[PDB]
Ligand binder design. Structure first.
Ligand code: CHL
Ligand code: CLA
Ligand code: CLA
Ligand code: CLA
Ligand code: CLA
Ligand code: CLA
Ligand code: CLA
Ligand code: CLA
Ligand code: CLA
Ligand SMILES: CC(/C=C/C=C(C)/C=C/[C@@]12O[C@]1(C)C[C@@H](O)CC2(C)C)=C\C=C\C=C(C)\C=C\C=C(C)\C=C\[C@@]12O[C@]1(C)C[C@@H](O)CC2(C)C
Lengths: 68, 197, 211, 158, 42
C-alpha cells in the first residue's frame, strides 16, 4: 500500500548521471529496493559492457528518465 | 498478377493495386511507400519520353531510307543547319522546361495545388489523378481505365529498353539501326554482337 | 514408396558392416555407402540425390553420343571421327554463338526446373480437361504425359523403386564410362572402340602398363 | 600544353626512353636460342611495352620535359581520363561498399547478441543484402530526406 | 555438416576466399589491359 518508488519492471531508462560510462544511455531496470534508507536503490542492466567489465550499477531516481 | 517467376511469392510492396504489378523488385528498393510513389512517377515520365524518343529515332530513319523524305540521322541532326542556332533553341527549351517541370514537381509535393492556369480563372482545370493529368491533356475524353495504364507502362518499359539498345548500338557501330536490321535479315548468324567485336 | 531397411533386404556394399543409421535406403540405388557422411542432414541428402539423378541422366546422354557415332564410323556407313576432337569441329557458326544460345535456352529451362525444386507443384505443365484428375509429382519424376507418356514411372510395368534403381545404377556406371573415356583420351589418342579392340587383340600386354 | 607540357605523341624524350628501353631489352634477348620460351616471353614483353608507348601516344597525355607522362587534374574535362571519370567510378564503388556494410549492420542489430553475427556473418542474410549496391546513391538520399540517416542526442548504448 | 557450414562462415576463411577472388579479378584485368594508366573510353 505504501507506493513503491522507482519504475515497475522492464522500463527502459535513460541515464541522466554524468560521471558514469552510460551518460545518455539506454538501460533496463531489474529491481528497486523499497527501503527508504538506501541512497542508490535502483539497479540497471545494459547491453554494452564498460571498461571494468561490469554491466550493472546503482542510481537514485533523480538520475533516471522513464523513457519508453 | 503475373509474377514473372512462376514459383516466387510477390513481396508485400507491390500488391496489385498499381498498374503493371508483377513483384519485379529482386532488390527491395521501393519497400518504402513514398519512394514507391516517387519511382512510379519516374517510370511514368521516363517511359513517356522514351516512347517519344524511340519514335523519333525509328520513324525518320525508315522514311528516309524509303525515298519519300530526307532527314539526317538522329545523331547526324545536331551538326545540321537550321533556321535557329543551337544555343538559342536550347535556352528557350531551358526556360520553358524550368516552368513546366517545376509545376509538375509542385503538383507532386502537393496534390491538387497548382491546378489553375494562374493567368485566367476560368478554363483552368478539373481535379486530376497524380501521374494522370486532367482535361487539357486528354482532349479525346479517353476514360483512364485499366488495360490502358498497363498497356502504357508495358510499351514504355519496352521503349526504354529499345532506346538503351539504340544508344549502345550506335556506340559500338555509329550506324543506323534499321541498317543493322537489314544486315541481320541478310544472315542473323553472320550479323550479331559477336562478329562486331 | 517402399523402404529398404537393414537386414537381408539391405545388401550392404561392405559385407559384415552396419550401414550409417541416417542411410535408410529409401532412395533407390542405396547400399549404405557414405563413409564421409555427407548425407548427414536431410536437406543435403535430397539436394545430393537431385544432383546424382541429373548427373546420371546427362552422363547417359554423353556416353551414348560418344559411343554410337564412333562405332558407326568404324564399321557403319558414315565415318564420325574422333569425338574428343569434334569439340573444335568447324560448323556454319562460331562456337561462341552456339555457347550463348545454349546458355540462354538451358538457363530458361533449368531455371523453371530450379523453381519447381524450390517450390514443388507450383511450376508444372499438366493440362486439365474437366473431370479427369491429374497426377502429383515426386520432383525428379515430373509425371504426366509429357515425360512419362509410356506410363512407365507409375506402377504397371515395374514397381517404381526397382526401375529408379535401374536408372541410378546405370547412371553411376555411365559416369564412370564418361570419366574413363575422357581420361583415356588424355592418355591415349584413339576412341573407346579402338582401345577396346586393342585390348581384345593383346589382353596380356596391351594395357595401361604397355609402356 | 598546360604550362608548356607537350604531349609525347610529339615530344622527343619519350621516344628516347622508349628507344633505350627496347634497346636494353633486345640486347638482353640475344643470349639464348631465338626460339627458347624465355626468349619468346622476352620478345613478348618487348612488343608489350612498345604497344604501351603507342597507347600512351593516343590519349592526349601531356608529357614532361624529361620524357614522362604527367597527369592534368586541374578540372578541365579535356584531360579527364585520368581523374574525373576514375574518381567518380571509385566513389561509386566506395559508396556501394559503405552502404552495403551499414545496411547489413543495421539489419543484424536486432538479435540476441549481435557480436555472434558480427564475428560469424549471416552469409544467407549477407547474400540477400549484398547486391543492393545499385541503390546506394538513391536510397541513402531518401534517408537524409526523411532524416533516418543520422541521430541527434543518442550517443552511448545504441 | 551444418557445423562445418557455421565454421566456414567464420570471418577468417570467408575473408581469405573473398580476397583471393578479388585479387584474381584484379590480376586478370591487368592481364587483359596491360599498364592501364588512363581512362581511354570517354
Ligand atoms: C540528351 C540526349 C541527347 C543525345 C543522345 C544527343 C546526341 C548527340 N548530340 Mg545533341 N544530343 C542530345 C541532346 C541535345 N542535343 C542538342 C543539339 C545538338 C547540336 C547542335 C549538336 C549535337 C551533337 C550531338 C552529339 C554529341 C557527340 C557525342 O555523342 O560525343 C560522344 C551526339 C550524337 C553534335 C553532333 O551532332 O555531332 C555529331 C552537334 O553539333 N546536339 C540539343 C538542343 C540544343 C539537345 C537537348 O537536349
Ligand atoms: C528492344 C530491344 C532490342 C532489340 C530489338 C535489339 C536488336 C538488335 N541488337 Mg541490341 N541491345 C539492346 C536491346 C535491343 N537490341 C540493349 C538493351 C543492349 C544493351 C545491353 C543491346 C546491345 C547490343 C549490341 C552491343 C549489339 C546489338 C545488336 C543488335 C542486332 C543484332 C542482334 C544481336 O547481336 O543481339 C543483340 C545483343 C544484345 C546484348 C541485346 C540484348 C537485349 C536484351 C536481352 C533485351 C531484349 C530481349 C527481347 C525481349 C528479345 C528481342 C525482342 C525482339 C525479338 C522484338 C539487333 C538488330 C548487334 C548489332 O547491331 O549487330 C548487328 C550488336 O553488336 N545490341
Ligand atoms: C527509369 C526507369 C524505371 C523506373 C523509375 C521504374 C520504376 C518501377 N518499376 Mg520498372 N521497368 C523499367 C524501368 C523503370 N522502372 C524497364 C526498362 C523495365 C523493363 C525491363 C521495367 C520493368 C518492370 C516490371 C516488370 C515491374 C516494374 C516495377 C516497377 C516499380 C517497382 C520497382 C521499383 O522500385 O523500381 C525502381 C527502379 C529504379 C529505382 C531504377 C534504378 C536504376 C537501376 C539501377 C537501373 C538498372 C541499370 C540501368 C539499365 C543502367 C517502380 C515504379 C514493378 C511494379 O511494381 O510494377 C507496378 C514490376 O512489376 N518495372
Ligand atoms: C556427382 C555425382 C554423384 C552424386 C551427386 C551422388 C550422390 C549420392 N550418392 Mg552416389 N555415386 C556416383 C555419383 C554420384 N552420387 C557414382 C558415379 C557412383 C559409382 C561409383 C556412385 C555410387 C554410390 C553408392 C554406392 C552410394 C551412393 C550414395 C549417394 C548418396 C549419398 C550422399 C553422398 O554420397 O553425397 C553426395 C556425393 C558427393 C557430395 C560427392 C563427394 C547421394 C545422393 C549412397 C546412397 O545413399 O545411395 C543413394 C550409396 O550407398 N553413390
Ligand atoms: C550429350 C550431348 C551431345 C552433344 C553435345 C553432341 C554434340 C554433337 N553431335 Mg551428337 N549425339 C548425341 C549426343 C550429343 N552430341 C547422342 C546421344 C546421339 C545419338 C547416338 C548423337 C548423334 C549424333 C549424330 C548422328 C550427329 C551428331 C553430331 C554432333 C555434332 C554437331 C551437331 C549436329 O550438327 O547435329 C545436328 C543434328 C540434330 C538432330 C540437330 C556435335 C559435336 C553430328 C556430327 O558429328 O557432325 C556432322 C551428326 O551428324 N550427333
Ligand atoms: C534410364 C532408366 C532406366 C530410366 C528410368 C526411369 N525414368 Mg528416366 N531418364 C534417363 C534415363 C533413364 N531413365 C535419361 C538419360 C533422362 C534424360 C533425358 C531421363 C529423364 C527422365 C524424365 C524427365 C522422367 C524419367 C522417368 C523415368 C521413370 C519412368 C523411370 C524410373 C519419368 C518419371 O518417373 O516420372 C514419373 C520422368 O518424368 N526420366
Ligand atoms: C567402366 C569402366 C572402365 C572400363 C571398362 C575401361 C576399359 C579400358 N580402359 Mg579405362 N579408365 C576408366 C574406366 C574404365 N576403363 C577410368 C575411370 C579411368 C580414369 C582413371 C580410365 C583410364 C584409362 C587409361 C588412362 C587407359 C585406359 C585404357 C583402357 C582399355 C585397356 C585396359 C587398360 O589398360 O586400362 C585399365 C583401366 C583402368 C586401370 C582404369 C581403372 C578404373 C576402372 C573403373 C576400373 C574399375 C573396374 C570396373 C568398375 C568393373 C567393371 C565394370 C563393368 C565394365 C563390368 C580398356 C578398354 C587404356 C586404353 O586406352 O586402352 C588401350 C589406357 O591407356 N583407361
Ligand atoms: C577553387 C578551386 C577549384 C575548384 C573548386 C575547382 C573545381 C572544378 N573545376 Mg577547376 N581549376 C582550378 C581550381 C579549382 N577547380 C585551378 C587552380 C585551375 C587552373 C587555373 C582550374 C582550371 C579549370 C578548367 C580549365 C576547368 C575547371 C573545371 C572545374 C569543374 C569540373 C570543377 C567543379 C572545368 C569546368 O568548368 O567544368 C567543365 C574546366 O573546364 N577547372
Ligand atoms: C561499412 C562499414 C563502414 C562504414 C560505413 C564506415 C564509415 C566511416 N568510417 Mg569507418 N571503419 C570501418 C567500417 C566502416 N566505416 C571498419 C571495419 C574499421 C576498422 C578497420 C573502420 C575504421 C575507421 C577509422 C579509424 C576511421 C573511420 C572513419 C569513418 C568515417 C569517414 C570515412 C573514413 O575515413 O573511412 C576511411 C576508410 C576506412 C577506415 C576503411 C574501413 C572500411 C572497411 C574496410 C569496410 C568494412 C566492410 C565490412 C567489414 C565487410 C563485410 C561486407 C558485408 C558482406 C557485411 C565514416 C563515417 C573515420 C572517422 O572517424 O571519420 C569522422 C576514421 O578516422 N573508420
Ligand atoms: C532502361 C531504363 C531503366 C531501366 C531500369 C530497370 C530495368 C530497373 C530494374 C530494377 O529496378 C527494378 C525494376 C527492380 C530491382 O529490384 C531490380 C532492378 C533491375 C534494379 C530507363 C531508360 C530510359 C530512357 C529514356 C527516358 C529515354 C528517353 C529518350 C529520349 C527523350 C530521346 C530523345 C531523342 O530522340 C529524340 C527525342 C530526338 C533525337 O534526335 C535526339 C534525342 C535527344 C536522342
Amino acid at each position: 500500500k505504501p507506493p513503491p518508488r522507482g519504475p515497475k519492471r522492464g522500463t527502459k531508462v535513460k541515464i541522466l548521471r554524468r560521471e558514469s560510462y552510460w551518460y545518455n544511455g539506454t538501460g533496463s531496470v531489474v529491481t528497486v529496493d523499497q527501503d527508504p534508507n538506501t541512497r542508490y536503490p535502483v539497479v540497471v542492466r545494459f547491453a554494452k559492457v564498460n571498461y571494468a567489465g561490469v554491466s550493472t550499477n546503482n542510481y537514485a531516481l533523480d538520475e533516471i528518465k522513464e523513457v519508453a | 498478377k503475373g509474377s514473372w517467376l512462376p514459383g516466387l511469392q510477390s513481396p508485400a510492396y507491390l500488391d496489385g493495386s498499381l498498374a503493371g504489378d508483377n513483384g519485379f523488385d529482386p532488390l527491395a528498393l521501393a519497400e518504402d511507400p513514398e519512394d514507391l510513389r516517387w519511382f512510379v512517377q519516374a517510370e511514368l515520365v521516363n517511359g513517356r519520353w522514351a516512347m517519344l524518343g524511340v519514335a523519333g529515332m525509328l520513324i525518320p530513319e525508315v522514311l528516309t531510307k524509303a525515298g519519300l523524305l530526307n532527314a539526317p540521322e538522329w545523331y547526324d541532326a545536331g551538326k545540321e543547319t537550321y533556321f535557329a542556332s543551337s544555343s538559342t533553341l536550347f535556352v528557350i527549351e531551358f526556360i520553358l522546361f524550368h516552368y513546366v517541370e517545376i509545376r509538375r514537381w509542385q503538383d507532386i509535393k502537393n496534390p491538387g495545388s497548382v491546378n489553375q492556369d494562374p493567368i485566367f480563372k476560368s478554363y483552368s482545370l478539373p481535379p486530376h489523378e497524380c501521374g494522370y493529368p486532367g482535361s487539357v491533356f486528354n482532349p479525346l475524353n479517353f476514360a483512364p481505365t485499366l488495360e490502358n495504364k498497363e498497356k502504357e507502362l508495358a510499351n514504355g518499359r519496352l521503349a526504354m529498353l529499345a532506346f538503351l539498345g539504340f544508344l549502345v548500338q550506335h556506340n559500338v557501330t555509329g550506324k543506323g539501326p534499321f541498317e543493322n536490321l537489314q544486315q541481320h535479315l541478310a544472315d542473323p548468324w553472320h550479323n550479331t554482337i559477336i562478329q562486331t567485336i | 514408396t517402399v523402404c529398404e531397411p537393414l537386414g537381408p533386404d539391405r545388401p550392404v556394399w561392405f559385407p559384415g558392416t552396419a550401414p550409417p543409421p541416417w542411410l535408410d535406403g529409401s532412395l533407390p540405388g542405396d547400399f549404405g555407402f557414405d563413409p564421409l557422411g555427407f548425407g548427414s542432414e536431410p536437406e543435403s541428402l535430397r539436394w545430393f540425390a537431385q544432383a546424382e539423378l541429373m548427373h546420371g541422366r546427362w552422363a547417359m546422354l554423353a556416353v551414348a553420343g560418344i559411343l554410337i557415332p564412333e562405332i558407326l564410323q568404324k564399321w557403319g556407313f558414315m565415318e564420325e571421327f574422333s569425338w574428343y576432337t569434334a569439340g573444335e569441329r568447324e560448323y556454319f557458326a562460331d562456337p561462341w554463338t552456339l555457347f550463348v544460345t545454349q546458355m540462354a535456352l538451358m538457363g530458361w529451362v533449368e531455371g523453371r526446373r530450379w523453381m519447381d525444386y524450390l517450390n514443388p507443384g507450383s511450376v508444372d505443365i499438366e493440362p486439365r480437361f474437366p473431370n479427369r484428375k491429374n497426377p502429383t509429382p515426386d520432383v525428379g519424376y515430373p509425371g504426366g504425359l509429357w515425360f512419362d507418356w509410356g506410363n512407365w514411372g507409375r506402377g504397371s510395368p515395374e514397381p517404381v523403386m526397382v526401375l529408379r534403381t535401374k536408372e541410378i545404377k546405370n547412371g553411376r556406371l555411365a559416369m564412370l564410362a564418361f570419366v574413363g573415356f575422357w581420361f583415356q583420351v588424355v592418355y591415349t589418342g584413339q576412341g573407346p572402340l579402338d582401345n577396346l579392340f586393342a585390348h581384345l587383340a593383346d589382353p596380356g600386354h596391351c594395357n595401361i602398363f604397355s609402356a | 600544353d598546360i604550362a608548356g607540357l607537350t604531349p609525347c605523341k610529339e615530344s622527343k624524350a619519350f621516344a628516347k626512353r622508349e628507344k633505350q628501353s627496347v634497346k636494353k631489352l633486345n640486347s638482353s634477348l640475344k643470349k639464348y636460342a631465338p626460339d627458347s620460351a624465355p626468349a619468346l616471353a622476352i620478345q613478348a614483353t618487348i612488343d608489350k611495352t612498345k604497344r604501351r608507348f603507342e597507347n600512351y601516344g593516343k590519349f592526349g597525355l601531356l608529357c614532361g620535359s624529361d620524357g614522362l607522362p604527367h597527369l592534368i587534374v586541374s578540372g578541365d574535362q579535356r584531360h579527364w581520363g585520368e581523374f574525373i571519370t576514375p574518381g567518380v567510378l571509385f566513389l561509386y564503388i566506395a559508396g556501394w561498399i559503405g552502404w552495403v556494410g551499414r545496411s547489413y549492420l543495421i539489419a543484424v542489430s536486432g538479435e540476441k547478441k549481435p557480436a555472434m553475427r558480427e564475428i560469424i556473418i549471416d552469409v544467407e542474410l549477407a547474400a540477400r543484402i549484398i547486391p543492393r549496391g545499385f541503390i546506394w546513391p538513391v536510397a541513402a538520399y531518401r534517408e537524409l530526406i526523411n532524416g533516418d540517416l543520422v541521430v541527434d542526442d543518442a550517443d552511448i548504448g545504441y | 555438416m551444418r557445423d562445418i557450414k557455421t565454421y566456414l562462415s567464420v570471418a577468417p576463411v570467408l575473408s581469405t576466399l573473398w580476397f583471393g577472388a578479388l585479387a584474381g579479378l584484379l590480376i586478370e584485368i591487368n592481364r587483359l589491359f596491360p599498364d592501364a594508366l588512363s581512362f581511354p573510353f570517354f
